[PDB]
RNA sequence: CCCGCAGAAGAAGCACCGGCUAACUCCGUGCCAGCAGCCGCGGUAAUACGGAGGGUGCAAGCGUUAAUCGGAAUUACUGGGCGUAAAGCGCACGCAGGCGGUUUGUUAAGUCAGAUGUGAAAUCCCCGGGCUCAACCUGGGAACUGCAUCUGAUACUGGCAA
RNA sequence: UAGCUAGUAGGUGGGGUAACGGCUCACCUAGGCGACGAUCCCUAGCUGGUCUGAGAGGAUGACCAGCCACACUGGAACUGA
């Protein structure tokens, strides 16, 4: 592939309007402590299947909707 | 059309040109793509004064680019090989 | 509340030392051990010992040179609140070279003298001179 | 190679039935030029008496510090009362740059090329003192091996 | 630019001879050096560390006839140039043409030797250099221009030039009135009575 | 203290009020003399200090000191003023540039003439 | 840029000198006039006011004002504090958040390694070269301590499992 | 300033653009954003860099170069690569 992320779902409840979280860890550029900088992404999944709390793999595509430039590639786990 | 020309980074009454490839419509001493030589018109008999990366130049020229009256002149003066 | 064991080591030492105390004990752990090693190997203590199976138990023998203790200063450097990670070119060298810095790399818990040689970096656990 | 120099001379007041009775205080530092340095204080109703009464105190009261040629081996911190001092090896170019008053002890001491700064109060009597104990605590660029090796 | 005032007044305050009347006589007197740079000149200045630090550099400055601006820059340079700031200072200070002119004995005083430069009557490796601070360097060769060669001043000049210690890093002639800067003067040449690390300290805080 | 703490609320650098609202950092400003006073100074001192209130080109109305010995300065005089308090006259935070606009230079000054705007007397 | 010509001829001023801070005397004045960055000078011997002579510092600039950083470890990440000096919420419970004993497996996000691309030129710096020097101009390096992809390493942290 | 949001968030089809696209429309879903700071208020061109500082930092964005934006103020398109 050309790059790809994962992250838990967080919201399935909309006609392919799936949203995915992506927690990271980063050095605070001033006080060293590592802290959690989350990223939410509006990703397309056809035939709605990824479920709230599913981990999922994601790739970056052309603009689907205003807001959507990512599609899913796979799934990973369920029933959290 | 992209062109090779003399950008002039001299100094009042002591000019010293940076010869350069660029978008012909850009300012003389402005946005360029790469430097491909220099031409010191004071240079003097001493030594250096017209270093010129012929390899890239005539690759841009083939690539499509074109050349100043005063640049091509430095080339049929630099001779080319010896 | 016992949220940083390594500090408790560094300090059970530091204290027990300043209390010219020969021995010292504490609950153990792979991580404690790997350090006790470097402390022995680099020779800031005589030798360690873990006595038990259910509830393991590090035991450290403190060195004393002249009247003084051998460990002039043992200080945490990374910690839960604020963690540290230097690369290789940026690893610290304590007392200009004298004494040393414990550092955990992907290839085990070594000194800065070591990691520098190993050519890699890690989390600088603590300083000791 | 006697080498000595006073750092700060000051006046003080005692106050009695009859008024204020003043006096002076010198603070001095003597060093041999190859380690070995001490400071002396000493106070007296008049200045020359006190600056001299001081010089002596220093001749006794004299520590010695493990140099490393012209410089310190590693960096060191010193801290007496309100003064927190810090000085550093410095692969000499010139060096000897420091807070005149701890430049005093540093040159007689024989260090030839260090950088220092004094934090907290620059109260002379406590810097020249914080630095001494500083150099003092410093240790054997070799006989850490003494400690270890073993 | 150039100081321009009474010359001895300086030597008196700086406490030492600065060779500003460099000419004929020696070991002053015929002046009054020391005990009165002014109306209270006698009085002893129990002076501070800042005082002494100030006067040393001031001394070195009154010596080569240089003003604060240039001098401050000389320091700035020395500091940059590798190896001991205080020395390079002196090096730079000596590489001065006007100085290398006087040193080779073409001029009684450093001043005279300088006026010489200013008056296009001097020539590094051939061509005329009429600016005092021209940096002279190894192998360079300075020579009085034929035009005004063996003229009043420069005779006497090259004369009592041998009365002086006579340098080392250079090689006079006196016939062809030319001289060759063999090497950048070592620390050990010159000085003793000048204490760099003071004028270093001065410009160091 | 804590790294969390500092992370949540970073350290902030005390920003510095001026001591001389000669508005926007200005080397000096022009103004017109509202009053030409002379009040007396504070505690230790005792005198009759010459001052003036000036409406400034920029709206501010402020009292400024008139340096020197003596001055023809009156209501409607057009003056220039620079930073410089006068600790003695509390609430006086500016000085009047003697020798500017309509402000005379001190008469007969020989020393320090550039302050107290006086021209080199004919040698 | 070069040559001749005349005559030293056309070319020195500004701040300061009580302490911090290099530089001291007299006279005038007398809590007045006035000085003053901070401390503080002025009521009869004022090195602090004003003039003078002297001196110190700069010098075609010199001082004053304004302005940023510095020293200020005086917002302390590097690098600080809270009993009596500024500072522990009157007390407790507790959501979020932060942190979390110990063992094995797995994960490889943090973390570490390497490779590659990228990080415009100028600037800064190092060695040079060109203008009488210098400023200035300029060849070439170095540096851009960053970012991204891939591949690795798994001690430590995070996830997962028991 | 603690809630903000109806083309709003998404889907389906037509239209549309040099092009992907709520870009537009019609219908369907009831979504979307937010205490890791939305919304609202205030200030502001950004950068290379500049000055300072041992550094870390602090301050700054003239002159040179790069990007953006504006051309009396608000609005609109036409021509044309
Ligand atoms: Mg005692
Ligand atoms: Mg000049
Ligand atoms: Mg003095
Ligand atoms: Mg005055
Ligand atoms: Mg009197
Ligand atoms: Mg600071
Ligand atoms: Mg404090
Ligand atoms: Mg209190
Ligand atoms: Mg309480
Ligand atoms: Mg643990
Ligand atoms: Mg660059
Ligand atoms: Mg040159
Ligand atoms: Mg784990
Ligand atoms: Mg459609
Ligand atoms: Mg604006
Ligand atoms: Mg600092
Ligand atoms: Mg312009
Ligand atoms: Mg319009
Ligand atoms: Mg069209």
Curated annotation (Swiss-Prot), chain A:
CDD domains: Ribosomal_uS17 (cd00364). One of its GO terms (cellular component) is cytoplasm. GO terms for biological process: cytoplasmic translation; response to antibiotic; ribosomal small subunit assembly. Keywords: Antibiotic resistance, Ribonucleoprotein, Ribosomal protein, RNA-binding, rRNA-binding. The keyword Ribonucleoprotein applies. Pfam families: Ribosomal_S17. It comes from the Bacteria. One of its GO terms (molecular function) is zinc ion binding. The keyword ATP-binding does not apply. Part of the 30S ribosomal subunit. NCBIfam families: PRK05610.1, uS17_bact. One of the primary rRNA binding proteins, it binds specifically to the 5'-end of 16S ribosomal RNA. Also plays a role in translational accuracy; neamine-resistant ribosomes show reduced neamine-induced misreading in vitro. Belongs to the universal ribosomal protein uS17 family. This is Small ribosomal subunit protein uS17. The lineage of its organism: Bacteria, Pseudomonadati, Pseudomonadota, Gammaproteobacteria, Enterobacterales.
Curated annotation (Swiss-Prot), chain D:
The keyword RNA-binding applies. GO terms for biological process: cytoplasmic translation; maintenance of translational fidelity; response to antibiotic; ribosomal small subunit assembly; translation. One of its GO terms (molecular function) is rRNA binding. Changing residue 12 to E: In strain: SPCR7; spectinomycin resistant. Not a ram mutation. GO terms for cellular component: cytoplasm; cytosol; cytosolic small ribosomal subunit. NCBIfam families: rpsE_bact. With uS4 and uS12 plays an important role in translational accuracy. Many suppressors of streptomycin-dependent mutants of protein uS12 are found in this protein, some but not all of which decrease translational accuracy (ram, ribosomal ambiguity mutations). This is Small ribosomal subunit protein uS5. The gene is rpsE.
Swiss-Prot record, chain E:
Residues 95-155 form the S4 RNA-binding domain. Gene3D superfamilies: Ribosomal Protein S4 Delta 41, Chain A, domain 1, RNA-binding S4 domain. Changing residue 50 to D: In rpsD101; suppresses a temperature-sensitive mutant of release factor 1, R137P. Not a ram mutation. PROSITE patterns: RIBOSOMAL_S4, S4. Belongs to the universal ribosomal protein uS4 family. Part of the 30S ribosomal subunit. Contacts protein S5. With proteins S3 and S5 encircles the mRNA as it enters the ribosome, which may play a role in mRNA helicase processivity. Some nascent polypeptide chains are able to cross-link to this protein in situ. The rRNA transcription and antitermination complex (rrnTAC) consists of RNAP, NusA, NusB, NusE (rpsJ), NusG, SubB, ribosomal protein S4, DNA and precursor rRNA; S4 is more flexible than other subunits. This is Small ribosomal subunit protein uS4. The gene is rpsD.
From Swiss-Prot, chain F:
Keywords: Acetylation, Antibiotic resistance, Methylation, Ribonucleoprotein, Ribosomal protein, RNA-binding, rRNA-binding, tRNA-binding. It comes from the Bacteria. Changing residue 42 to R: Confers streptomycin resistance but not hyperaccurate translation. GO terms for biological process: cytoplasmic translation; Group I intron splicing; maintenance of translational fidelity; positive regulation of RNA splicing; response to antibiotic; RNA folding; translation. The modification N6-acetyllysine is found at residue 107. GO terms for cellular component: cytoplasm; cytosol; cytosolic small ribosomal subunit; ribosome. Changing residue 87 to Q: Confers low-level resistance to streptomycin and a 15% decrease in the translational elongation rate. CDD domains: Ribosomal_S12. PROSITE patterns: RIBOSOMAL_S12 (PS00055). The modification 3-methylthioaspartic acid is found at residue 88. With S4 and S5 plays an important role in translational accuracy. Part of the 30S ribosomal subunit. Contacts proteins S8 and S17. Interacts with ArfA. May interact with IF1 in the 30S initiation complex. Belongs to the universal ribosomal protein uS12 family. This is Small ribosomal subunit protein uS12. The lineage of its organism: Bacteria, Pseudomonadati, Pseudomonadota, Gammaproteobacteria, Enterobacterales. The gene is rpsL.
């Amino acid at each position: 592939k050309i790059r790809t992320l994962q992250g838990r779902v967080v919201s399935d409840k909309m006609e392919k309007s799936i949203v995915v979280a992506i927690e990271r860890f980063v050095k605070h550029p001033i006080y060293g402590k590592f802290i959690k900088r989350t990223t939410k992404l509006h990703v397309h999944d056809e035939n709605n299947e990824c479920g709230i709390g599913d981990v999922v793999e994601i790739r970056e595509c052309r603009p689907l909707s205003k807001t959507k430039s990512w599609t899913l590639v796979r799934v990973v786990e369920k029933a959290v | 059309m992209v062109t090779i020309r003399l950008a002039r980074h001299g100094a009042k009454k002591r000019p010293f040109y940076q010869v350069v490839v660029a978008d012909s419509r850009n300012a003389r001493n402005g946005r360029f793509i790469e430097r491909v030589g220099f031409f010191n018109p004071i240079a003097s008999e001493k030594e250096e004064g017209t270093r010129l990366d012929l390899d890239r130049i005539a690759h841009w020229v083939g690539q499509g680019a074109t050349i100043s009256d005063r640049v091509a002149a430095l080339i049929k003066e630099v001779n080319k090989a010896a | 509340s016992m949220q940083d064991p390594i500090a408790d080591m560094l300090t059970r030492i530091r204290n027990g030392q300043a209390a010219n105390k020969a021995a010292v004990t504490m609950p153990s752990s792979k991580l404690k051990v790997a350090i006790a090693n470097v402390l022995k190997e680099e020779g800031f203590i005589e030798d360690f010992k873990v006595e038990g199976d259910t509830k393991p138990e590090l035991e450290l023998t403190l060195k004393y040179f002249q009247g003084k203790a051998v460990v002039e200063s043992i200080q945490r450097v990374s910690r839960p609140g604020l963690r540290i990670y230097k690369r290789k070119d940026e690893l610290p060298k304590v007392m200009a070279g004298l004494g040393i810095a414990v550092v955990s790399t992907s290839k085990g818990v070594m000194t800065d003298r070591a990691a520098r040689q190993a050519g890699l970096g890690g989390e600088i656990i603590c300083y000791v001179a | 190679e006697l080498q000595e120099k006073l750092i700060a001379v000051n006046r003080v007041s005692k106050t009695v039935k009859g008024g204020r009775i003043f006096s002076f205080t010198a603070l001095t530092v003597v060093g041999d030029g190859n380690g070995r340095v001490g400071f002396g204080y000493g106070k007296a109703r008049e200045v020359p008496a006190a600056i001299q009464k001081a010089m002596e105190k220093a001749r006794r009261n004299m520590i010695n510090v493990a140099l490393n040629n012209g410089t310190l081996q590693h960096p060191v911190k010193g801290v007496h009362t309100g003064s927190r001092v810090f000085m550093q090896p410095a692969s000499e170019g010139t060096g000897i740059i420091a807070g005149g008053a701890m430049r005093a002890v540093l040159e007689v001491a024989g260090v030839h090329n260090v950088l220092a700064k004094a934090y907290g109060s620059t109260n002379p009597i406590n810097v020249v003192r914080a630095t001494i104990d500083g150099l003092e605590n410093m240790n054997s660029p070799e006989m850490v091996a003494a400690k270890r090796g073993k | 630019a150039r100081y321009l005032g009474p010359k001895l007044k300086l030597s008196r305050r700086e406490g030492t001879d600065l060779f500003l009347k460099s000419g004929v006589r020696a070991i002053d007197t015929k002046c009054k050096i020391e005990q009165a740079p002014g109306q209270h000149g006698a009085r002893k200045p129990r002076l501070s560390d800042y005082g002494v630090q100030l006067r040393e550099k001031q001394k070195v400055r009154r010596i080569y006839g240089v003003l604060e601006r240039q001098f401050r820059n000389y320091y700035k340079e020395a500091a940059r140039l590798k190896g001991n700031t205080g020395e390079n200072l002196l090096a730079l200070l000596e590489g001065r043409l006007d100085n290398v002119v006087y040193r080779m004995g073409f001029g009684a005083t450093r001043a005279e030797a300088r006026q010489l430069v200013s008056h296009k009557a001097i020539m590094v490796n051939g061509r005329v250099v009429n600016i005092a601070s021209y940096q002279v360097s190894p192998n360079d060769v300075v020579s009085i221009r034929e035009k005004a060669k063996k003229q009043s001043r420069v005779k006497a000049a090259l004369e009592l030039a041998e009365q002086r210690e006579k340098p080392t890093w250079l090689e006079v002639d006196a016939g062809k009135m030319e001289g060759t800067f063999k090497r950048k003067p070592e620390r050990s040449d010159l000085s003793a009575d000048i204490n760099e690390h003071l004028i270093v300290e001065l410009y160091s805080k | 203290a804590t790294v969390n703490q500092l992370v949540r609320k970073p350290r902030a650098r005390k920003v510095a009020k001026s001591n001389v609202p000669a508005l926007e950092a200005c080397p000096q400003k022009r103004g017109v003399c509202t009053r030409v006073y002379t009040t007396t100074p504070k505690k230790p001192n005792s005198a009759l200090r010459k001052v003036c209130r000036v409406r400034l080109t920029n709206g501010f109305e402020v009292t400024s000191y008139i340096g020197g010995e003596g001055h023809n300065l009156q209501e409607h005089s057009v003056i220039l003023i620079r930073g410089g308090r006068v600790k003695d006259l509390p609430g006086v935070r500016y000085h009047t540039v003697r020798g500017a606009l309509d402000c005379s230079g001190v008469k007969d000054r020989k020393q320090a003439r550039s302050k107290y705007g006086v021209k080199r007397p004919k040698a």
